[PDB]
């Protein structure tokens, strides 16, 4: 239910910390995760027969 | 009509399905 | 149409009801 910047990554690795944010709002609650330390995200990893 | 195109993300395969003339057009592209 | 399927949770029974051709298709599945 929280929003994270690495949700759309095919693969990930993290090490560090993580901020959890729960702010109620009338336009939609702000429910976020902010990761710090090291973040590595991989997107769309196609490999050819070569 | 127009040829049917099917894209597979896992294998990176393109599949064209239609009349022989509509398929030769995709084949040259 | 298509065959009617009835599933009983208590006894884990599948009941297929239709034409003899439609029933032999489920029977092989």
């Amino acid at each position: 239910g929280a929003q994270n910047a690495s949700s759309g990554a095919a693969a990930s690795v993290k090490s560090g910390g993580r901020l959890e944010i729960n702010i109620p709002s009338a336009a939609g609650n702000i429910v976020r995760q902010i990761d710090y330390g090291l973040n590595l995200d991989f997107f769309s990893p196609q490999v050819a027969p070569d | 009509q127009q040829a049917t195109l099917i894209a597979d993300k896992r294998t990176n395969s393109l599949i064209v399905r239609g009349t022989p003339e509509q398929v030769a057009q995709v084949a040259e592209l | 149409q298509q065959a009617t399927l009835i599933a009983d949770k208590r006894t884990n029974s599948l009941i297929v009801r239709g034409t003899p051709e439609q029933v032999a298709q489920v029977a092989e599945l």
Binding site: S44 | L14, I15, V16, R17, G18 | -
Partner: protein
């Protein structure tokens, strides 16, 4: 004809008979087949998505 069963009972003198059978051996062959109205090709892409 024996109904519509692709058979044909033909009944005449033997001269006519061995002549008609030699002609029919020449001008009678199975019909050709339609090709198809639909084909498939599969392309394994290497560089694009």
């Amino acid at each position: 004809p024996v109904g519509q069963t692709g058979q044909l009972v033909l009944n005449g003198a033997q001269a006519q008979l061995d002549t008609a059978l030699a002609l029919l051996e020449q001008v009678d062959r199975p019909a050709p087949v339609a090709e198809s109205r639909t084909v498939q090709r599969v392309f394994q892409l290497v560089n694009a998505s």
